C-alpha cells in the first residue's frame, strides 16, 4: 500500500481462534450451533501479542502461515492482522487485564526490546502487510482516568513507550492504528478535546510516522456503528454510536496536524441495544451478537474498514471474586456468569455471540 491498507488484501483469519472454536467450542455444541461455529472460526478477528511468549510463538508463526498461503497464491494476497498489547502497568483503571510487566520491575525495558523485537520479525516478514491495533485503553485511560492512582503514576511511561512503539514499528508494509476507545469513553463532549491534543502530541512526538494510519474504537466494546434511536444507556451523550463518535473527533484531530483514518470493531456489537445497564459496563456484556464481518466496504469516508479486533468469546475477566485480577465489573448483572481470566475461552459467551449474531 498505497492508501487503505485494507484495499487490495484478505485479513487472515488466525489458527488460534479456529483452534480455540474447533478444540473447546465445537464438541460441546449441537450441530447446527458447531456449524454456525465452523463460520466463525474462518472469519478474521485480530491476534492479540498480550504476552511476550507470544512474540517468538504466536506472532512469528502466524507470519509464516500467511507467507506460505500467499506464496501458494492467495488472491488477493492475505495481510496480518496483530494488537500490541503489553504495556508494563497495563489496564491501570481496571483489575481483570493486568499484564505480566511492571513499571517498578523493569517494564518500560522488558516493552522496549518486546517492541525491538517485533520489529526485526516485522523487517523478517515485509512481503506481508500487516495491520497493527496499538494498545487497547492505553491513551484513553490518560484522558480520563487520571484520577486512578495506577494510571497516573503509569502516565509518563505510556507516552513514552507509545511514541517508541510508533517510531520503531514505523515500517512501509504496516499500518497503525492507535487505539482511542469508544463513543462512550471518549466520545463524551468532555472528553473528545482533550482526547484530540493527546492523540495529536503523541503523533506529532513521534515524528509524524507515515505508517501511522489512524484510530481505531469500540476495541473489546460494543457500541453501534450508526443507529437511528440512541439507546437508553448512551443518554445524554450525542455521540451515541461510533459514527457520531467518529465524525465529531476526526476534526478536531485534524485541527491538530493528525487526519486519522479509523477502524471500527464490530465483533461484539451485531446486536442493537446491547444488555448494558449502564454504558460504563464494559465486561462480558450480557445480549451482545457477532456483529458485521470484517470489510473495506464501509461506504464512510473516515473508516478504512470494519474489523474484529476483540475476539469473540475470548474473557474480558473472571468472574471469581477471590481470584486477583478480579474486577467488579465482571462481576455485575449485565455481565456473563461464571466467566473465566481474561483472554482464556468463555463457552457460554462463545455461544450467546453465535446466537445473537446479526447478520446471521
Ligand atoms: O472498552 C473496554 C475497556 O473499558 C474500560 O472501561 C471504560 C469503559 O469502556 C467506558 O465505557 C468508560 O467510559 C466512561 C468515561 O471514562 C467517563 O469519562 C464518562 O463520564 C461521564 C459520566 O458517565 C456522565 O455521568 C457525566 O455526566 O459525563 C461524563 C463525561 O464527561 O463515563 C463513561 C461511561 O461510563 O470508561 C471506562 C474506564 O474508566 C476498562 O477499564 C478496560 O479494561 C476495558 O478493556
Ligand atoms: C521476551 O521474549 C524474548 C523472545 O522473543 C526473550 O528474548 C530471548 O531470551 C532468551 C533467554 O531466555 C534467549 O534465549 C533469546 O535469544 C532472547 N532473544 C530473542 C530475540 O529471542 C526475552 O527474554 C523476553 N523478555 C523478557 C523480559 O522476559
Ligand atoms: O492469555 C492469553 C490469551 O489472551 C488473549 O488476549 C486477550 C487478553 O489476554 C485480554 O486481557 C483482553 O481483554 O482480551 C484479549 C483478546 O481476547 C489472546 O487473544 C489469546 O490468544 C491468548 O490465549
Ligand atoms: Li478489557
Known sequence: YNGNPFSGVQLWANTYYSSEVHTLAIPSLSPELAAKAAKVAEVPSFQWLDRNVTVDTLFSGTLAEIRAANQRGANPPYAGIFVVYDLPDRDCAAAA??????????????????????????????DIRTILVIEPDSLANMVTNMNVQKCSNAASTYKELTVYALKQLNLPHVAMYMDAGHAGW?????????????????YRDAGRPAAVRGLATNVANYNAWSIASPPSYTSPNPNYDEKHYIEAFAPLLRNQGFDAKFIVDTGRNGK????????????NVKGTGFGVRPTAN???????????????????????????????????????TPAPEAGQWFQAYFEQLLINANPP
Open 186 to 202: 471518549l466520545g463524551w463532549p468532555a472528553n473528545i478535546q482533550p482526547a484530540a491534543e493527546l492523540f495529536a502530541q503523541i
Open 298 to 336: 464501509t461506504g464512510h469516508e473516515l473508516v478504512d474498514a470494519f474489523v474484529w479486533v476483540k475476539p469473540g468469546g475470548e474473557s474480558d475477566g473472571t468472574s471469581d471474586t477471590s481470584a486477583a485480577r478480579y474486577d467488579y465489573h465482571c462481576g455485575l448483572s449485565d455481565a456473563l
Open 272 to 283: 442493537q441495544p446491547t444488555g448494558q445497564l449502564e454504558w460504563g459496563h464494559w465486561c
Open 97 to 126: 487485564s493486568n499484564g505480566e510487566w511492571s513499571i517498578a520491575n523493569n517494564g518500560a525495558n522488558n516493552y522496549k526490546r518486546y517492541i525491538d523485537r517485533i520489529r526485526e520479525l516485522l523487517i523478517q516478514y515485509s
